[PDB]
């Protein structure tokens, strides 16, 4: 509220309030799967310029 004038005698005064806020950050874990050639099978797919099918 508006501040109080201090004149003569008074004990009822306007107040200053306080507050706290908690901010929360969420972290999420995600995954992907992909297919590939097995290590030991690469020699049977090696070509002149590349490796693969």
């Amino acid at each position: 509220a508006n501040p109080t004038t201090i004149a003569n005698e008074v004990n009822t005064i306007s107040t200053i309030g306080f507050s706290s806020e908690v901010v929360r950050l969420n972290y999420l874990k995600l995954q992907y799967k992909f297919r590939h050639l097995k290590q030991t099978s690469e020699k049977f797919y090696t070509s002149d310029s590349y490796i693969g099918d």
Binding site: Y32, S49, G52
Partner: protein, 52 residues
């Protein structure tokens, strides 16, 4: 070879006096890569990935 081939020796000596081509200014150093082929064809493969 140079003891027996004067033309080869002379080419080796005078090759330095030839100036660089002007095509080099049109490309960046990473955009030029030599291949080993005189005449014929050479295929290249580009691989891509996508999210499904």
């Amino acid at each position: 070879l140079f003891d027996e081939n004067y033309y080869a020796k002379a080419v080796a000596n005078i090759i330095g006096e030839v100036k660089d081509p002007i095509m080099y200014k049109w490309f960046s150093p990473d955009q030029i890569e030599d291949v080993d082929l005189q005449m014929g064809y050479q295929k290249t493969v580009k691989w891509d990935a996508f999210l499904n």
